[PDB]
Amino acid sequence: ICQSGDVLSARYEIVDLGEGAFGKVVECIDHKAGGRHVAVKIVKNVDRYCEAARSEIQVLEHLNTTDPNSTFRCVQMLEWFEHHGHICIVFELLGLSTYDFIKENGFLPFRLDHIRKMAYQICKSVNFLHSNKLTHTDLKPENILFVQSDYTEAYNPRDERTLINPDIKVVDFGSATYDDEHHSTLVSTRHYRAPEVILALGWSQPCDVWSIGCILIEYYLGFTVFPTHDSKEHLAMMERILGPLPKHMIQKTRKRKYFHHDRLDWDEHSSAGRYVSRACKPLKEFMLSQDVEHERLFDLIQKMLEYDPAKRITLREALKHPFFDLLKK
Ligand SMILES: COC(=N)c1nc2ccc3ncnc(Nc4ccc(OC)cc4F)c3c2s1
Numbered sequence: 001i002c003q004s005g006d007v008l009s010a011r012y013e014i015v016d017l018g019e020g021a022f023g024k025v026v027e028c029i030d031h032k033a034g035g036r037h038v039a040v041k042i043v044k045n046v047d048r049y050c051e052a053a054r055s056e057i058q059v060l061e062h063l064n065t066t067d068p069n070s071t072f073r074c075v076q077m078l079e080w081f082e083h084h085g086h087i088c089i090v091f092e093l094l095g096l097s098t099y100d101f102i103k104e105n106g107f108l109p110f111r112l113d114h115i116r117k118m119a120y121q122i123c124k125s126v127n128f129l130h131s132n133k134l135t136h137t138d139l140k141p142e143n144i145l146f147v148q149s150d151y152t153e154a155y156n157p158r159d160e161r162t163l164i165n166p167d168i169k170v171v172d173f174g175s176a177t178y179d180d181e182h183h184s185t186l187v188s189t190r191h192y193r194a195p196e197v198i199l200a201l202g203w204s205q206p207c208d209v210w211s212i213g214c215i216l217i218e219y220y221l222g223f224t225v226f227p228t229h230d231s232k233e234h235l236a237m238m239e240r241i242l243g244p245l246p247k248h249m250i251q252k253t254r255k256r257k258y259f260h261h262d263r264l265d266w267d268e269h270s271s272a273g274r275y276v277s278r279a280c281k282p283l284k285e286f287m288l289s290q291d292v293e294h295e296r297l298f299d300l301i302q303k304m305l306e307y308d309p310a311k312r313i314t315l316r317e318a319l320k321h322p323f324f325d326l327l328k329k
Helices: 048-065 098-104 112-131 206-221 230-244 247-253 273-279 292-305 322-327
Strands: 010-014 021-030 037-044 078-082 086-092 145-146 151-154 160-163 168-171
Touching: 010 037, 010 151, 021 086, 021 151, 021 168, 021 322, 048 078, 098 145, 098 160, 098 206, 112 292, 112 322, 145 160, 206 292, 292 322
Parallel strands: none
Antiparallel strands: 010 021, 021 037, 037 086, 078 086, 145 168, 151 160
16 A cells, blocks of 8 residues: 555545655645545554554544644644555644754754744643653654744855744654553553653653653754663763652652663763763753843753652743743734
């Protein structure tokens, strides 16, 4: 399936957007909504993804009927159907993901004024899930999309792309979990995974706040501050960047394998040791300016990466953070 010219459910004519673990997202003309263009997510016919897609449709029926005008900027689902035993989800058509924009921008960062608007809308959208006893669990730049990704290009003492409109929506509700629903041990894409998740101390709304903080650094720098595919390495990077893990979380965790007594079981002089030393350093040292508005973002990021998820700032508090004052003038 998934070639252009193909028609899905005698309605959606494929014209073009993105592969992934789940399957494919294609652009389609809706021949039965005045030729409106739509995005259609074709999901692998694989138990893990079938489950997740059935679950995403459930969550999207709720979010879309709770918020029919999309004030809280969750992507609108139009319809869903089966095509050769594949689940297909039809959504409003957005622009590039923030990940795909950054990449197409030569992995250059967003300017600060754009990060402020985007940060605000992310916190607003996700806080809305948090109000409805939902946790996203998988926030990341790939899953934040521009409503519209049109740009202007211009040189800079390196060629640069700036968004005309930085408005975003949030997508992928396939991992989203209700407060009372069963809570998987593994959640999030490693680089955006909260410490309560790695340590299997149980997680909720706060694991989204950690993810967002990670997203905000990535937008600021153009790269992740956790460039890793290993759990222990991840905890070690957190240490050099955020300070020691709390006493209590280390001694609660059944994830004892990561520990030698009460210290992280970490060789400084081994290959990965040397990597963490060189590539990681105290968070505030990644600042590109000492400007107040830079200091203000960084104060918010630091709160979002509070180790203890109880102490971790909530998105309700995050929206009243100073960094957003400029938006209220
Ligand atoms: C792109 O136009 C859209 N309306 C989309 N609507 C949805 C709805 C659900 C989606 N659920 C998961 N992913 C989506 N996109 C996606 C984002 C970044 C990627 O690589 C960097 C790959 C992707 F496929 C989705 C998209 S993309």
